[PDB]
Amino acid sequence: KNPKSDKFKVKRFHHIEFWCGDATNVARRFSWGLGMRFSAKSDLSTGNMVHASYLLTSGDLRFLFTAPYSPSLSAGEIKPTTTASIPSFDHGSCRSFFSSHGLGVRAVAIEVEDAESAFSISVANGAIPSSPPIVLNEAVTIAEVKLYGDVVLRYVSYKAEEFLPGFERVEDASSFPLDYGIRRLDHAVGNVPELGPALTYVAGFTGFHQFAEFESGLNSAVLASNDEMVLLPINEPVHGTKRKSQIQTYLEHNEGAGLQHLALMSEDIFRTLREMRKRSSIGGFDFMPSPPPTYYQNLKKRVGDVLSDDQIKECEELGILVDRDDQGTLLQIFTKPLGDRPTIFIEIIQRVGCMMYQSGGCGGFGKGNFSELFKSIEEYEK
């Protein structure tokens, strides 16, 4: 059941912005680890005396890394005379965010038809405004409202129908064409102390609807746009369990609510994981410990009609997890945390089925892999 109740026209995920202390080192690490190309910049070399911002792209996926310069470089500026390319940026907010949370996502940005209308309708329906609509070079409009914690939902709309004005394309000599197969952001997941009030708030101002699902330490629910291509799952911890909830660990180490993981769709998850795993110990990303062979022995009875024995052994080599709902099949794997704190991590996913284009959320989000991993663990103990 999809009531298609969006209160304004939403297109697709546009970009994800990390707030950093040094944008250069995080961007360069991420570029090598994930196979993303340096495509645009806004920094001292482009006249930005306020913040350094570097954009990585892989297919339609856009990762932005931003850090503040010394305020003294821009102490003479006022908002009318700012050299910042992202006018919502604030030195104090950014330093407060990074000191509170460490490295993490500040903005989940979605493209809309009309960012000024989206902002107005959202705030009229309970959204807490974060940065009012601002028109950049008469071409792009950006506005921000609070999503959860210190994470904002960023609306971006373009008149034309090239990232943002004041960003410059990166010199091809500095722009190496890395590509490990990642193509787009599939979903973005938040952790909160209380799921109910978080859902009521976000569904309240967006009109997003609850996306149908099928001892883990969590309760979760997924908000979706009309065509279910913008997917925003939210988790709360379940307390009193034998094993401590990873949602509660997140909230403690993050100093509260924030973005838990980014799920990145790959057009070939086997190629992506081969390429990422080759770089784990040479500057890239690490992956969670693989499931036992019993898990992959049990893959025959569950998805033997979807993957061959060879495609299943390839899953075992790479530690890929597999889940399935009534519509389709999900291949997924999780990285270890991206930075110092046990907070944000990345998911790589590929979805099989639901062809009409592929419909959103085909195969679900892998909640079956909680019980399946418990089973395979005790089963492998033997």
Ligand X SMILES: CCOC(=O)c1nc2ccc(C(=O)C3=C(O)CCCC3=O)c(C)c2c(=O)n1-c1ccccc1
Binding segment toward Co ion, per CB under 5 A, in 21-29, 125-133, 245-253, 364-372? 364-372
Backbone angles phi, psi at 22, to 5 degrees: -135, 110
CA distance 96 to 107: 15
Out of 246, 294, 298, 311, the only residue in the binding site for ligand X (CB under 6 A) is 246
Query: Is residue 347 near Co ion by the rule CB under 5 A?
Result: yes
Which strand (E) or helix (H) includes residue 2? Answer: none
Beta strands 218-224 and 321-324 are: unpaired
Query: Is residue 189 near ligand X by the rule CB under 6 A?
Result: yes
Contact yes or no for 329/323 (Cβ under 8 A): yes
Give the torsion through C-alpha atoms of 154, 160, 161, 162, to 10 deg. -70
CA distance 18 to 151: 10
Cβ contacts of 20 within 8 Å, gap of 6 or more: 26, 65, 66, 67, 98, 103
Neighbours of 168 (CB within 10 A): 15
Binding segment toward ligand X, per CB under 6 A, in 32-40, 195-203, 302-310, 368-376? 368-376
Binding track, positions 201-240, relative to ligand X; x by CB under 6 A = -------------------x------------x-x-----
Binding segment toward ligand X, per CB under 6 A, in 56-64, 89-97, 133-141, 364-372? 364-372
Binding segment toward a second copy, per CB under 8 A, in 97-105, 124-132, 314-322, 361-369? 97-105
Query: Is residue 325 near Co ion by the rule CB under 5 A?
Result: no
Query: Is residue 25 near a second copy by the rule CB under 8 A?
Result: yes
Out of 125, 339, 353, 359, the only residue in the binding site for a second copy (CB under 8 A) is 339
Annotated binding site: 187, 261, 347
Which parts of this chain interact with ligand X (CB under 6 A)?
187, 189, 220, 233, 235, 246, 261, 263, 288, 334, 347, 365-367, 369-370, 373
